[PDB]
Curated annotation (Swiss-Prot), chains A, B, C, D:
Gene3D superfamilies reported for this sequence: 1.20.1260.10
Function, in words: Stores iron in a soluble, non-toxic, readily available form. Important for iron homeostasis. Has ferroxidase activity. Iron is taken up in the ferrous form and deposited as ferric hydroxides after oxidation.
Organism, scientific name: Aquarana catesbeiana
Subunit structure: Oligomer of 24 subunits. The functional molecule is roughly spherical and contains a central cavity into which the polymeric mineral iron core is deposited.
Binding residues for Fe cation 1: E23, E58, H61
Note: There are three types of ferritin subunits in amphibia: L, M and H chains. M and H chains are fast mineralizing; the L chain is very slow mineralizing.
Protein known as: Ferritin, middle subunit
Disulfide-bond pairs as recorded: none
GO biological process, one term: iron ion transport
Recorded GO MF terms: ferric iron binding; ferrous iron binding; ferroxidase activity
Amino acid sequence: VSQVRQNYHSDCEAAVNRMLNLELYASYTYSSMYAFFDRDDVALHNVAEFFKEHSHAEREHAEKFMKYQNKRGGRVVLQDIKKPERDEWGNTLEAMQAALQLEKTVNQALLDLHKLATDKVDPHLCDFLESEYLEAQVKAIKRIGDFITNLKRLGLPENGMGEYLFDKHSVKE
Amino acid sequence: VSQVRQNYHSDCEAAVNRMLNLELYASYTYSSMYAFFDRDDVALHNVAEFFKEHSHAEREHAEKFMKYQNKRGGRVVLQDIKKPERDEWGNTLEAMQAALQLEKTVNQALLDLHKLATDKVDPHLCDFLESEYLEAQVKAIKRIGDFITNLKRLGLPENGMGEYLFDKHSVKE
Amino acid sequence: VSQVRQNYHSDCEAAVNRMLNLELYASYTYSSMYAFFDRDDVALHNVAEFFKEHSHAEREHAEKFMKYQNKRGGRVVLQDIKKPERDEWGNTLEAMQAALQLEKTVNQALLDLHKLATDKVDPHLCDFLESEYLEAQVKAIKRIGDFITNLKRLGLPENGMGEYLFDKHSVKE
Amino acid sequence: VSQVRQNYHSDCEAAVNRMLNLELYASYTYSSMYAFFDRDDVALHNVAEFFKEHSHAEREHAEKFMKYQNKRGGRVVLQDIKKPERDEWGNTLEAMQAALQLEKTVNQALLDLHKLATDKVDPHLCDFLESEYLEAQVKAIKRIGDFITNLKRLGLPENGMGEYLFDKHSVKE
Ligand SMILES: [Cl-]
Ligand SMILES: [Cl-]
Ligand SMILES: [Cl-]
Ligand SMILES: [Cl-]
Ligand SMILES: [Cl-]
Ligand SMILES: [Cl-]
Ligand SMILES: [Cl-]
Ligand SMILES: [Cl-]
Ligand SMILES: [Cl-]
Ligand SMILES: [Cl-]
Ligand SMILES: [Cl-]
Ligand SMILES: [Cl-]
Ligand SMILES: [Cl-]
Ligand SMILES: [Cl-]
Ligand SMILES: [Cl-]
Ligand SMILES: [Cl-]
Ligand SMILES: [Cl-]
Ligand SMILES: [Cl-]
Ligand SMILES: [Cl-]
Ligand SMILES: [Cl-]
Ligand SMILES: [Cl-]
Ligand SMILES: [Cl-]
Ligand SMILES: [Cl-]
Ligand SMILES: [Cl-]
Ligand SMILES: [Cl-]
Ligand SMILES: [Cl-]
Ligand SMILES: [Cl-]
Ligand SMILES: [Cl-]
Ligand SMILES: [Cl-]
Ligand SMILES: [Cl-]
Ligand SMILES: [Cl-]
Ligand SMILES: [Cl-]
Ligand SMILES: [Cl-]
Ligand SMILES: [Cl-]
Ligand SMILES: [Cl-]
Ligand SMILES: [Cl-]
Ligand SMILES: [Cl-]
Ligand SMILES: [Cl-]
Ligand SMILES: [Cl-]
Ligand SMILES: [Cl-]
Ligand SMILES: [Cl-]
Ligand SMILES: [Cl-]
Ligand SMILES: [Cl-]
Ligand SMILES: [Cl-]
Ligand SMILES: [Cl-]
Ligand SMILES: [Cl-]
Ligand SMILES: [Cl-]
Ligand SMILES: [Cl-]
Ligand SMILES: [Cl-]
Ligand SMILES: [Cl-]
Ligand SMILES: [Cl-]
Ligand SMILES: [Cl-]
Ligand SMILES: [Cl-]
Ligand SMILES: [Cl-]
Ligand SMILES: [Fe+2]
Ligand SMILES: [Fe+2]
Ligand SMILES: [Fe+2]
Ligand SMILES: [Fe+2]
Ligand SMILES: [Fe+2]
Ligand SMILES: [Fe+2]
Ligand SMILES: [Fe+2]
Ligand SMILES: [Fe+2]
Ligand SMILES: [Fe+2]
Ligand SMILES: [Fe+2]
Ligand SMILES: [Mg+2]
Ligand SMILES: [Mg+2]
Ligand SMILES: [Mg+2]
Ligand SMILES: [Mg+2]
Ligand SMILES: [Mg+2]
Ligand SMILES: [Mg+2]
Ligand SMILES: [Mg+2]
Ligand SMILES: [Mg+2]
Ligand SMILES: [Mg+2]
Ligand SMILES: [Mg+2]
Ligand SMILES: [Mg+2]
Ligand SMILES: [Mg+2]
Ligand SMILES: [Mg+2]
Ligand SMILES: [Mg+2]
Ligand SMILES: [Mg+2]
Ligand SMILES: [Mg+2]
Ligand SMILES: [Mg+2]
Ligand SMILES: [Mg+2]
Ligand SMILES: [Mg+2]
Ligand SMILES: [Mg+2]
Ligand SMILES: [Mg+2]
Ligand SMILES: [Mg+2]
Ligand SMILES: [Mg+2]
Ligand SMILES: [Mg+2]
Ligand SMILES: [Mg+2]
Ligand SMILES: [Mg+2]
Ligand SMILES: [Mg+2]
């Protein structure tokens, strides 16, 4: 037993490792989206940069779980980071729809971990999730949903002018 | 009788209380418009913020009537603030059309109060309305009318690209 | 279903709308207290300003619930804002006693909403209440209680000199 | 006829001269109050300074009527400035009560002049009164009324401690 460990269930330790992996998986998916929108035959650079930044944020989320694991006396156990589900992402609308679903998948895993922490009477882990993850996730989901609404309004997928306008006026330039 | 009261007719006092209520009603309607445009399935945030700011301005108009009532020695009497006429506002054009009509309703009440003040030979109340309300109202009506003209030019309600462009280029970002 | 909605029970959505209304009701009550203490025959302007500021804070609390509702994919539904229970507030002690009871009523509604969120296993809503409302409410209740103790010490309601001194030395000038 | 005169009735010209005199009379009354509160056996120096400043304001009001008369092509005609009604002013409450009545007397004369200007269809004179006099008068009346309420609360005339406290905490130090 680690000398620091106190009130930290094995099941929570394992679930933190699985969360770590999911954040890295999300990072990798966003990096694929970045590379897609940077292609010369796609060429939506503000969209590309939105996804690149989101890829970096997900890696930071993973690193924070590594630090957490060690603070509690658990042990980081890594697994392969699976490649993203697609090699090409269609257009801004398809990518944003995939991002929404990814963020909801990550959110569900965070909520499931919170429920496990509750069941194991681990208020430190509950606080960590509430203070560092759950609100960021709700904000990200709302932002992407708002974008999808605007992309539909702009006539995606068919309306290329609408897609251009979104890249120039909705995503940080 | 209040020790400060001079040349202040009971009818004017009552009409100031009714005006106070109407300004609060207008504030509440604009707050509903804010919440509508902030929905994830509407997502026109500059439009939402335009209405939020207008909601705050109307509350300030109400507070100025409270202060006025007390300065003249009248007594503030509050009534329920009725909920807005609609729960959802359609789109930017429908909302702006409703805002125009609301501003004209408020303007008519201000003009009616000015006429009452004239009839009761109350130049202080006439000056207050002319100096603090009537020009602001004309300016607001002109601004909203100009917006409606532009929304129609942009093809509202059908043209979603036009609606997007209005949010990005006509309302403060 | 809203595209953003996840783990948000209909009962919580409805209870957030009812909370929104209660915050607006509290705002309106404080605005009535402001207007009362600004009367020429009351004339306790620091007390009046204390209540005016509290009225603005309550409106901010309501607006934060509107934003929350939309972030979760719920729908803001507004109801009439009922007028305050009294048209005149007696004196500083009576008003502060009414404010204490109002703050405790709002606190109880917040606690009830937290219990509902707990029952529906909604940690995001629990965090929101704990981080944005519950401590502010405890602080406000303590402040008003401290004021009541001092008003009683100063001989309210009978001791007008005590009431004057409170306005000049306990409330921000 | 003055080369500048246009739309300026003889009756209004005369009434402006009478107003000029009344403002000077009010100034002189306030100067008497200043001297009273500066007596060694009264010795309420913040109260004294309040009245001294008000004396200067009234003289400025008179000078503005002189300038107005000349701008319109009327002719300033001066009369004796009558001494104040009392040689001694009792205490802060009695003085403030006299000041309230004086301000209401001046207000009534301003309102009467506005009515004359209205009857003679003189919008420039109406604007001048509304823009330069009527609101200042309402503000002054409200301020003095608020003071009287506080002096009564403080137990004037009997409560000398209350009178001391008013001088130290209600009037600019
Ligand atoms: Cl342990
Ligand atoms: Cl334990
Ligand atoms: Cl264990
Ligand atoms: Cl593991
Ligand atoms: Cl694997
Ligand atoms: Cl996918
Ligand atoms: Cl693919
Ligand atoms: Cl997914
Ligand atoms: Cl889990
Ligand atoms: Cl726990
Ligand atoms: Cl967070
Ligand atoms: Cl957006
Ligand atoms: Cl957008
Ligand atoms: Cl009257
Ligand atoms: Cl009159
Ligand atoms: Cl009347
Ligand atoms: Cl009324
Ligand atoms: Cl009603
Ligand atoms: Cl409507
Ligand atoms: Cl509706
Ligand atoms: Cl209307
Ligand atoms: Cl009216
Ligand atoms: Cl008039
Ligand atoms: Cl105006
Ligand atoms: Cl325009
Ligand atoms: Cl453009
Ligand atoms: Cl425009
Ligand atoms: Cl749900
Ligand atoms: Cl869940
Ligand atoms: Cl549900
Ligand atoms: Cl509801
Ligand atoms: Cl109702
Ligand atoms: Cl009550
Ligand atoms: Cl009452
Ligand atoms: Cl209550
Ligand atoms: Cl509840
Ligand atoms: Cl929970
Ligand atoms: Cl809080
Ligand atoms: Cl205290
Ligand atoms: Cl003191
Ligand atoms: Cl205190
Ligand atoms: Cl003439
Ligand atoms: Cl003419
Ligand atoms: Cl003439
Ligand atoms: Cl003359
Ligand atoms: Cl004479
Ligand atoms: Cl006298
Ligand atoms: Cl005398
Ligand atoms: Cl008099
Ligand atoms: Cl006259
Ligand atoms: Cl005229
Ligand atoms: Cl003025
Ligand atoms: Cl005062
Ligand atoms: Cl005072
Ligand atoms: Fe993440
Ligand atoms: Fe994420
Ligand atoms: Fe208004
Ligand atoms: Fe308005
Ligand atoms: Fe543009
Ligand atoms: Fe509140
Ligand atoms: Fe509160
Ligand atoms: Fe003091
Ligand atoms: Fe004057
Ligand atoms: Fe005066
Ligand atoms: Mg060891
Ligand atoms: Mg284990
Ligand atoms: Mg996994
Ligand atoms: Mg594989
Ligand atoms: Mg629990
Ligand atoms: Mg937080
Ligand atoms: Mg946003
Ligand atoms: Mg009275
Ligand atoms: Mg009446
Ligand atoms: Mg009405
Ligand atoms: Mg109804
Ligand atoms: Mg103006
Ligand atoms: Mg313009
Ligand atoms: Mg949908
Ligand atoms: Mg429902
Ligand atoms: Mg309720
Ligand atoms: Mg009722
Ligand atoms: Mg806190
Ligand atoms: Mg304290
Ligand atoms: Mg000549
Ligand atoms: Mg003449
Ligand atoms: Mg005279
Ligand atoms: Mg004489
Ligand atoms: Mg006029
Ligand atoms: Mg004017
Ligand atoms: Mg003015
Ligand atoms: Mg004041």
